[PDB]
Structures are given as structure tokens and as C-alpha cells.
Symmetry: D2
């Protein structure tokens, strides 16, 4: 028993809508457990550090985030330190809200699994707090900074119908097969 999943690509209106809350009657239930399992499976397959339900075609407020040690480790040390990229365990948020904790802007290239094959530089706040429910209805709060805060912002934007191309420095948009190099 295997099935297919797909990450929706830009043009699909589900990516531009504002996702509906998960109804309380759904908390702790099998449908929501299937959705969270699916999100995490695709995230792990694609090695993407976060993913949201609208990207699997489900217009609900659910997102997952996970940054394993191996992904950080593959980033050259100087880049890792400049991007403040450090590992954190899996968190799934249902009906989350975001508050900015440190509004200083930091710009780095970002991509998106729903705009496959492109990167552009995007300003993001240095630190944010995400608060919401876990799939069982318990309150979860996470204050994060650096690269963790960027991923949180990217996924929360997807629940608002916002993609990185709405916020990018467009002159840095590039196919991934083009890159800057040292001479």
C-alpha cells in the first residue's frame, strides 16, 4: 500500500487562498492524522525543512517544520554561521498565529517546493514566535530566530496565500542551474 502525493505548483489557486482553520471536531482525529503524516512524509522525501497543507492541495491551517542535523552539516561552515542555521526537531502546528519578536530584516536566497527549480533573495524578520495547537489540541509556542524563523515565515505565508515571489528581490530570481561562483 503506496499512493501518490504531489506538491501543488504556482497557478493552482489553492496556493493563493487563505487556508481555513481546522475545526475542533477534527483534533486528535484520523483525517488530520493522515494529513500530518502525509506532510511529514513529503517533507522528508524532498528534504524540505517545512511544508504546509495547501501545498498538498488541502486548504487548511496545518504546517510542519523539521531541520535534521545532516542538512545543517552539508551547509559549508561559514554559510551555516551567517544563515544561523541550526537543527531543530519536528513540530506540527494546527491553526497557528505569528508574532514578530525581532523585526530586523535578513536577506538570503530562498526557494519553494511549489515554485520548483528557482531561488531568489527574500528579506525575513530575524526572530518570530509561532503559537498554535499540536494535532491533539495541546497549545504549542515556539520562539525562533535565524534560519528557523525564516522557515516559519515561509510556511505561515503559505497559509495566508502568499508565496516567496510576492516578497523577493526580483533581480535575484534564478533557475537553480545558474549560480554565482568564486574565481
Amino acid at each position: 500500500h503506496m499512493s501518490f502525493s504531489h506538491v501543488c505548483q504556482v497557478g493552482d489557486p489553492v496556493l493563493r487562498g487563505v487556508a481555513a482553520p481546522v475545526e475542533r471536531a477534527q483534533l486528535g482525529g484520523p483525517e488530520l492524522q493522515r494529513l500530518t503524516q502525509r506532510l511529514v512524509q513529503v517533507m522528508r522525501r524532498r528534504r524540505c525543512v517545512g511544508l504546509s497543507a495547501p501545498q498538498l492541495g488541502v486548504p487548511r491551517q496545518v504546517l510542519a517544520l523539521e531541520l535534521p542535523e545532516a542538512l545543517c552539516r552539508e551547509c559549508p561552515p561559514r554559510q551555516r554561521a551567517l544563515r544561523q542555521m541550526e537543527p531543530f526537531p519536528l513540530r506540527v502546528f494546527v491553526n497557528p498565529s505569528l508574532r514578530v519578536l525581532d523585526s530586523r530584516l535578513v536577506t538570503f536566497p530562498e526557494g519553494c517546493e511549489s515554485v520548483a527549480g528557482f531561488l531568489a533573495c527574500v528579506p525575513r524578520f530575524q526572530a518570530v514566535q509561532i503559537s498554535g495547537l499540536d494535532p491533539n489540541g495541546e497549545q504549542v509556542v515556539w520562539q525562533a530566530s535565524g534560519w528557523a524563523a525564516r522557515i516559519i515565515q515561509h510556511e505561515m505565508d503559505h497559509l495566508q496565500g502568499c508565496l516567496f515571489i510576492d516578497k523577493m528581490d526580483s533581480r535575484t530570481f534564478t533557475n537553480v542551474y545558474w549560480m554565482k561562483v568564486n574565481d
Copy 2:
């Protein structure tokens, strides 16, 4: 002995530079003739209404525009009328400058052979004039409105290192395989 040409894709720095002028001594010469012939051939093969030399990898101020009646007629007459699409003959401009004559903005979806496979709505001026040299070196001023004005602006933008993604309504960006249709 046929040869290969390619249209450079976003990420290639040639699309973001400011094209150099063509020097007087090159006007009417074989190298400029080869370049104009290649632009026209590509433009006709791809059925694009305009193309610029930076998109063939050549950072020089040369562009070509042509809208055959068949291409207008393939647009549904309602959409054709809304877009004020009318045919025009081939023109090649060398070292052109643009003047805006009617600054009212008109918004429709536009694509770009150097961002293959996407469209987005882009506001453009209603009427403009382009003045420049032909490949032989005679001064031409071409005044146009509606869709022709839009194509002139798109190609002029390429010579200044500007792509439509810099000017779009980003919430309308889409892969070409997603579209709005009538119920």
C-alpha cells in the same frame, strides 16, 4: 550546416545587464546582419512577437518585433479586441530609445521566452514610440498603442536588464498549464 541557437533563461547575467550600443562602424556590416537574421529566425520559430539580442546571449542594443495576422487571428476576437491586438510588419531596431506617449496603464498576462513556461499580469503603458536605427542605419520613429506598445516595452526592458517578473502583479504568476476558463 544548420546551427543551434538558444534563448538564455533567467539566472544568466546577460539578461540583467545593460546592453551596449552598436557602434556606427558596425551598421550595415555582416556581423550585425548575422545577428538580425538570427533574431528573426528565432522569433519566427518560437512564434514570439518580439525578441532582443541579450536573449540570444549578445549584450547589444538590437531588438525585432513582428505580429503576423495569423497570430492575431488565433486570439479569440473578444480577447483580441480587449487587448487591441492588430498585426504589424517586421521591424528591427538598433540603439532604440522609448518615449511614453499615453501613460495610462493597461494590465494583461504576459510571458517571456527567457522565463519559459510562466505568465503573469503586467501593467504597461497604453501608447509609446520607439526611435532608433535600422540595421542599415536609417533613423525610424514607430508610434504604436495597445498590444504593439506592450511588446515594444517588453523588448525595451530586455535591453535595460529588466524582465517582466520585476514589474508583474506577482499574485497572478502561473505555470502555463494552469489557466482560468469560462464555466
Copy 3:
């Protein structure tokens, strides 16, 4: 009212299934009319000469074919003659079958809206007959040669879960932004 339609891309398993027949009880009915209208609208929007229901996510044996004079004339007359491209009116086929009338092979580049942005050369039979039902259940037959026969064979292949990449000369596969031109 407006809605969105999308052409499923390679990877979607709907493109590799064998489409089920339309049941006699659905012939003439409103659900089948909605499907045929949608096919034709996408085909006219994308300027593709044929399209099949699996490509709109509907695993049923329905396809449509149309080559307007305008679209035909966008092809240079030399190339049009070489490919035996001539205009033909809209035909919609339900539960079609194909008979080969002239088994001689003809090889030219073709693309597919469900593998957006690529072409490759594919050998096709020179002449075929498609027979099936129109949406109202009337028996319809069309004997076609040249480019029309190629488009018939490409859409029929979609109903059997076959894409052109299964039959192509793989050394000729190319992004559309690479092309061979005349010196």
C-alpha cells in the same frame, strides 16, 4: 462564472492509466458536456491541436481535435507542406478506436502539454482512421493523413496511458528554448 483548469504533468498517475470507457448512460448528458466544453476551452487557450480527458485529470475515453486555419498559417508554408499540415474542424470522440491505413512512418518533433516545454522527434503512421461516438452517441469516423494523423495518434496514446517520451528518439529530446536554425 469562472474557474481554473490545469493540464496534469508527467508524474501524475492519471496519465499512465488506461482510461475507462464512457458508459452508454452518460452519453448526451450534462456531465459529459461539461467535460467536452472544458477540453475544447483548454485546447483553444493553449493553441494545442488536440487534448484528451486524462490530461484534465479525468480517466475517461474522450478526446478532441481541431486545427484552425489561423493556427495552421502560423507555421511557415515550407514547413507546413513538409509536415502535410492542413486545417480541420473540431471533432470530439468518445470511446474511440484506431485503425492504421498507411503504416509508413514519418518522423518529426512533437511536444505534449502534459510534458510542458520539451519536444522530441517521434515516428508516426502516415494515415489512420479514428472511429468512435460523438458526445450524443452518434457513430463518427475520420480518415486522416499527415499532421492530422499524428495528432490523432498522440491523443489516442494518451487514452492508453502512453506519452510521447515512451516512443521518442531520445537523442532529439530538447527544451523548447534550444533549437536548430538555418545559417
Copy 4:
């Protein structure tokens, strides 16, 4: 300093040519050194396990392979074991030749930086020997099995103008945003 590099995409005829050998006189030389440095830099930026000089536009018999432990550990351990995926240090080979040591075929999905965004299943031999020169002219022979043997075969095919779409199970070709998952 700051310069751009790009991985050529399918359609560029450089990918279908047979790369020329590096001449004796060039071994240990500055031009070869520039090439090998560039190739390794691109390969490391893209995190691709292997890369060949034709893919940077240079039709010469030079390839590079490297699988650091972190990159390897991004693959989940069960898939890593199934694929016999183990880390290995950087090798740059000049004028390599390949000998098959175990002709048993193993099939897994493979991609290619010059066909960005797609995967397909490709059968490869289970064990091979690559013999060639290091950039200094020293003779190096590497006997490899499992996933390393796959990457060596893929890069050696690049030097002969062969891409993985020539050898794939075409019914398994997919955009990377479609995937099979476990329920």
C-alpha cells in the same frame, strides 16, 4: 571572486557530443586546473554527487565525484542500505575508462542536473572499475559498487554524449513534485 556558472540543459548539443581527451601537455597545467576547480565548485554548490565537464560547456574528458558523509546521511537509513549508498572522497578523473566488474543490473530512480527537475528509473551495473588520471597525471583506479557505481556510470555516459533519458524506463519518468509514498 564573483563570476557565474551554469549547468547546460538538454538541447544544448554539447551534451550529446563525445568529449575530447585532455592532451598529455595539458596535464598538471593551469587551464586544466581552472576547469577542475570550477567543476568541483559547481558540484559542491548543487550537492550533486557527480558532474562532468560537458555539463559546464567544456567538451573534454573530465569528471568529478564526491559523496560527503552529511549528504549521505540526508538519505534515510533503509533507502541508504537498499541503494548501497556510502560516502566517498572527492575524485577528479581525466581521460577515464570504465570496465564492468559485476553486470548484474540494479534499477532505482536517477536524475540529472542537465535535465533539471525530473527523475526516472534507470538500470545500472552493480559494480564497475573507473581508471584514469588525476589532474596531475597520476594513474588512479577506483573499484565501486552500488550507488557509487551508478554515479560513475552516469558521469561516464555524459562524456560519451548519453543522458539518462536514453536508458530509462520511460513509464517512470516524473516531475520531482510527484512522488509515491507509503500509507
